[PDB]
Design a binder for this molecule. Sequence first.
Ligand SMILES: CCCCCCCCCCCCCCCCCC(=O)OC[C@H](COP(=O)([O-])OCC(O)COP(=O)([O-])OC[C@@H](COC(=O)CCCCCCCCCCCCCCCCC)OC(=O)CCCCCCCCCCCCCCCCC)OC(=O)CCCCCCCCCCCCCCCCC
Ligand SMILES: CC(C)=CCC/C(C)=C/CC/C(C)=C/CC/C(C)=C/CC/C(C)=C\CC/C(C)=C\CC/C(C)=C\CC/C(C)=C/CC/C(C)=C/CC1=C(C)C(=O)c2ccccc2C1=O
Ligand SMILES: CC(C)=CCC/C(C)=C/CC/C(C)=C/CC/C(C)=C\CC/C(C)=C/CC/C(C)=C\CC/C(C)=C\CC/C(C)=C/CC/C(C)=C/CC1=C(C)C(=O)c2ccccc2C1=O
Ligand code: HEC
Ligand code: HEM
Ligand code: HEM
Lengths: 139, 162, 536, 102, 30, 184
Amino acid sequence: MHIEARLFEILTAFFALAAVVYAVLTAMFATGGVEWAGTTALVLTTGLTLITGTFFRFVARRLDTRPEDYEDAEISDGAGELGFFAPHSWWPILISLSFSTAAVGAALWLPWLIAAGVAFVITSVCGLVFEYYWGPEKH
Amino acid sequence: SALLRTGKQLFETSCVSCHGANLQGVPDRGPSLIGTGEAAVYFQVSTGRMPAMRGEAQAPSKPPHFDESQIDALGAYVQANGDVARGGDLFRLNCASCHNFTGKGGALSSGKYAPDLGDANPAQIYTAMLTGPQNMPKFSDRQLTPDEKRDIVAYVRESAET
Amino acid sequence: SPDFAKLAAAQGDAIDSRYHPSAAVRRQLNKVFPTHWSFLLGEIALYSFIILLLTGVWLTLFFDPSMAHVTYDGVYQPLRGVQMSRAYETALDISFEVRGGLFVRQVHHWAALMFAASIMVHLARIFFTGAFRRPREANWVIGSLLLILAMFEGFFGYSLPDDLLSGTGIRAALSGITMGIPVIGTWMHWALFGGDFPGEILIPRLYALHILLIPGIILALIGAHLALVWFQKHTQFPGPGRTETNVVGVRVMPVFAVKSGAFFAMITGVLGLMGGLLTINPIWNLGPYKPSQVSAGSQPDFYMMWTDGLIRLWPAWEFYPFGHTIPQGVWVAVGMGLVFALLIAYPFIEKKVTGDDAHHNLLQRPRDVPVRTAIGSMAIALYLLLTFACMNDIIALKFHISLNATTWIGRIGMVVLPAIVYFVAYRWAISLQRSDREVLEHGVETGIIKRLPHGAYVELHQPLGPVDEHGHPIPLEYAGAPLPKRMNKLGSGGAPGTGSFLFPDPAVEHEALTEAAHASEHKSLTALKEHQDRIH
Amino acid sequence: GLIKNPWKPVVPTAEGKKAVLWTSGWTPRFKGETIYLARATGRPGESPFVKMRPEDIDAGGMETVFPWRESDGDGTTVESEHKLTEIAMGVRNPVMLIRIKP
Amino acid sequence: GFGPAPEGMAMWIIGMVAAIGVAMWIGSRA
Amino acid sequence: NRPNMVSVGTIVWLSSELMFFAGLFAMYFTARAQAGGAWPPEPTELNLALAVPVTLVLIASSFTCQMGVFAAERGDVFGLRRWYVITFLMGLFFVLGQGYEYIHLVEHGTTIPGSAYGSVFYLATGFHGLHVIGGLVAFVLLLARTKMSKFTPAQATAAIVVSYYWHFVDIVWIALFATIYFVR
Ligand SMILES: CCCCCCCCCCCCCCCCCC(=O)OC[C@H](COP(=O)([O-])OCC(O)COP(=O)([O-])OC[C@@H](COC(=O)CCCCCCCCCCCCCCCCC)OC(=O)CCCCCCCCCCCCCCCCC)OC(=O)CCCCCCCCCCCCCCCCC
Ligand SMILES: CC(C)=CCC/C(C)=C/CC/C(C)=C/CC/C(C)=C/CC/C(C)=C\CC/C(C)=C\CC/C(C)=C\CC/C(C)=C/CC/C(C)=C/CC1=C(C)C(=O)c2ccccc2C1=O
Ligand SMILES: CC(C)=CCC/C(C)=C/CC/C(C)=C/CC/C(C)=C\CC/C(C)=C/CC/C(C)=C\CC/C(C)=C\CC/C(C)=C/CC/C(C)=C/CC1=C(C)C(=O)c2ccccc2C1=O
Ligand code: HEC
Ligand code: HEM
Ligand code: HEM
């Protein structure tokens, strides 16, 4: 899983090179002081590819060569199970409607419909999360 | 003080038709007074669809838009809550785009002049500045201190009278 | 010393010697009712009606219904020295000068709204599941009068305080619609007012109707309505042991005397919270009804909102056929009188259209009737459109749309929107049927993929019955079953390990509470299986 | 018992006791009654109807005015019944004294 | 508005939700 | 030998919320440099008391949340439940602790209008206040989810990724504590 992690360790080597150079060249050459609105988003976009980048490094250092990482592996190596994949669910339609009724109210500034929209999000995020964990009924 | 019995009966006679603490459906309603006080809720909004209750150059008469004692009483009922030259220049900077030129940002024909403001006075201007207007953001507390509001109101008043 | 066993045996021998309710009571107790969540929707309208009794008998110990004028001189400071009716001053004495009278007043209005909401939710259970068929035609008709009487009971209720907001509703409805009826004219307008509006005998006539005359017909109809579902027995959805002549469910004495008594405690507990927390009708903000005044939000309650929304949507269509005139209000009095005619006489215009006139005891699942689901959801979409055009001034101010364009999305929408809800529900109810045939032909579509050794991603469906050497198993028949779509609802989740939320049990008491729990449901499964094979 | 005639002559106008719904308070009792366009001074329950000059409002009036008998006054209990039947017991009295800009 | 319209809206999303949501816990699904 | 998809799908997402707090820091520093002539709290005083005894609770919350996620990897369904109720009640002490700090700074100092510092304080620490309340929701929706199934390795994986969200909220607050109270 080496070149999944190296793809995020080239970007954080460039952005650290593009945040040191940008902070220095706006420290001595900007018309005022150090410009902060651009060097903030570059020190934290080499933080994007460092939270993600160093996590893929810890995983590629723990895992062995999986059948994707081998050069010419036969197709009969993935004989096991893939995992779980939700085949159908009407919960993503009711989280999008519930988050778009807390954003209409955030736009029109209706506090009775933001708080009715946040409560529709939680009662529908509960539906999507709990969907494959209920058990039968007790009657 | 203003008589709240008169204020309630005036609300019922003249404002209940569009306002039950809610706003009139037709066009845009005035809505609930924000930071309700005599200074802003008292100051009328002749501009726009809303009718002008106070009439300039009006002697005491039975048919009238509003009564000085009636206005104060209703403004109070709604409000339950349960360097002059230096000031004018500052107002132009903050409101330079619309106030500057004494004109109106929304309508070129509309102006901040006394004919446009009818029966204007310093208190009416100060009050609309404090909470601003229906289409203008309020300035008190949020943006400008009392001296600044007082100075900008005086500058606008002197510019319009002259 | 008390005993309560010999004292309760000699009391039962005393009742059975005076009277003899032995065989009479046991058949009532051994009555079997189906356990289903939808079958409790009619009990909310039965339990909200008892709360309207108990908080309405209280509320008439303090209300004076006259219209005689009197100044206030009481306790509310804005309304001091205002010429009001005595119906409005005592409605301000309940709110202010009676200890906890504002609470019982607010509970009584929310119990009025939970009543008239759960009649509408109960009509939708009866309509879509088809409980109005052959034996229960007249129980629809006894029922659908209780909905019409609940419209006018509530409308005569909030018109008793003589509010400014609630007095212009009488001037709009009872004085505008009744004045332009072409059938008899304005002769009725002097017969329900005693003169010109407001008159003097309006509210004492609306206090007589609203206490004895209409709740004496509602309680008489309810008594002829729950005593139909008791004796022609309750319907049931089809399932394992449900064969059109059984009632599979639970009895009355140990169970359903508890879960229908504890549900009455929880409906009343909601109206206790809603009646105390949420304010419902402040009649002290807007003052008394004086005809010179005006209120910017003159709207009825939600059960009467579709009548106000119907007046706003009809365009200004008058006739003038002679020297006389015909106003716009004829289109509502024949519009209200046609909605009430196609809602009472619905089961007789489906015996004529479909021709299915056989004795039906099993309900039919509302995806299996694609047309009447689509006729029904057409009617909700037409009801929801009228009640969102009566509050268009609140849609104008808050939602920032218009006040002119909210009728043109209503009047154009009154034809267009119930035409495309018919198409998006007839093609929805059929596609729910096709989802029930994929879980029978192939099986419960779980999530596990398992790449085969030659590629070939599969999904390892669960067969739901007998298997075969062929790939898909033997296909079952439908027979109105609910057909579970997910594998956790079948036996694949498992118990989380018994114990507290923080500390476990010592695992000798865990294997005993899961061996005797997977065998106490397996005993429940072979019970119906050995009863379904006895019938068939 | 509860069926009344809407066209019985009740209101004594100058045209020979015309019926209700053709009388709206502004119908003169005799030839020269001269009903004044009188406004209310706020809270019109116990408020005396002051008169109105035509120059009282500048532009955009919105003054709800009422009929005034010019014999009532205020203070006495005999003539206070004339102002209780003026507004609360009398519908289709109030009119809008709207002023148009020149 | 503060009359019957936000009160009628608060009936269906608070009252009838907590009157149907109770019945789905007392009752069954069949 | 498969790299735990839901854990990868969260830390890929948790790098986006760092950029959500990149546009909220960039509002703070540009209203400190190009607007602060004096020190940026001019009419207010930031007290480290009630700001240090609520940031020592989040650090100890990560010391108890990580002890919960050790119980999910072993199989202790009840050890997972014990150390998240500690994490829930100490995260709720942070919302109630900082929520009392906001009331102390409105009726005494700068509200969110009327102050240049008043907008870059109630939004930098404000959207952190909604990533804790939004995080405590995810503890209720996880501990109640452990009451419904047999505690699979998918129940443990769902407790890995809620733990990663809480350590992210914990580290972002250190980037807010060591920014607005110390680098005033
Ligand atoms: C903002 C306004 C809010 C005001 C509140 C008003 C809301 C109405 C009340 C809702 C009442 C619901 C029923 C209650 C009785 C049942 C109780 C029960 O346990 O039965 C189990 C029941 C299943 O039992 P079952 O029938 O025997 O099992 C059969 C199978 O399981 C069956 O399997 P399945 O496949 O069939 O799935 C069934 C399940 C499918 O699961 C789900 O879909 C969702 C499950 C969770 C739903 C509830 C989550 C939270 C509730 C609202 C929270 C609001 C927060 C924001 C509020 C802001 C206010 C300022 O569906 C349901 O059970 C129906 C639930 C109905 C959803 C309620 C929608 C709320 C409307 C929001 C209105 C907003 C108000 C706006 C007004 C503004 C001002 C004017 O499951 C539930 O219903 C759970 C509901 C729990 C809600 C009670 C409150 C939660 C308190 C817990 C907090 C914990 C604190 C910290 C703890 C520490 C760690 C643990
Ligand atoms: C004011 C008021 C209450 C009036 C009610 C009086 C009234 C108008 C009644 C209507 C009379 C009608 C329409 C009767 C038709 C019934 C009918 C078709 C009978 C056919 C005969 C038959 C099937 C068998 C013959 C044997 C027979 C009649 C009776 C045997 C049992 C005996 C001896 C007595 C039963 C009498 C009795 C205790 C009845 C109680 C029934 C009632 C009203 C229960 C109330 C009730 C409650 C309280 C619920 O909570 C509930 C919750 C969920 C679902 C339903 C109910 C429900 O029905
Ligand atoms: C099912 C039915 C109505 C069949 C009619 C049969 C038929 C063919 C009749 C012909 C006559 C015609 C054409 C009648 C047209 C309909 C009409 C004018 C009157 C009928 C009135 C009536 C019986 C209506 C019943 C429909 C109704 C109110 C509810 C059923 C909806 C269902 C199935 C479930 C409700 C689910 C539920 C509790 C949701 C709560 C949350 C939501 C989404 C609430 C939506 C909502 C609603 C539903 C409001 O009523 C409302 C009113 C005021 C303010 C706000 C709201 C609001 O938000
Ligand atoms: C006793 C006080 C009072 C009464 C009575 C009153 N208004 Fe207003 N109105 C205001 C105030 C104060 C504003 C300024 C907006 C605000 O409050 O923010 C206003 C603003 C308006 C506006 C918006 C003007 C703008 O430019 O923003 C309209 C339209 C309006 N009113 C219409 C009416 C109509 C129509 C009536 C009666 C038929 C009426 N008003 C009666 C106090 C009143
Ligand atoms: C919309 C008006 C109504 C109609 C058309 C109607 C019709 C029906 C029908 C056909 C049944 C069939 C029996 C079954 O479901 O198997 C029924 C049941 C029932 N109804 Fe109604 N009904 C209405 C309103 C009411 C009201 C207002 C109440 C409250 C008193 C009520 C109480 C009940 C009860 C208790 C039952 C039996 C169990 C239940 O479904 O709750 N109904 N109704
Ligand atoms: C035993 C039968 C009933 C009696 C004696 C009764 C009595 C009363 C009384 C005295 C009021 C007083 C008005 C006020 O308090 O301001 C009232 C109000 C009301 N009633 Fe009833 N009622 C009964 C049944 C019902 C029913 C069945 C409904 C359902 C439609 C209903 C709906 C209302 C409403 C909406 C109000 C107005 C509440 C308010 O003023 O805020 N009532 N009732």
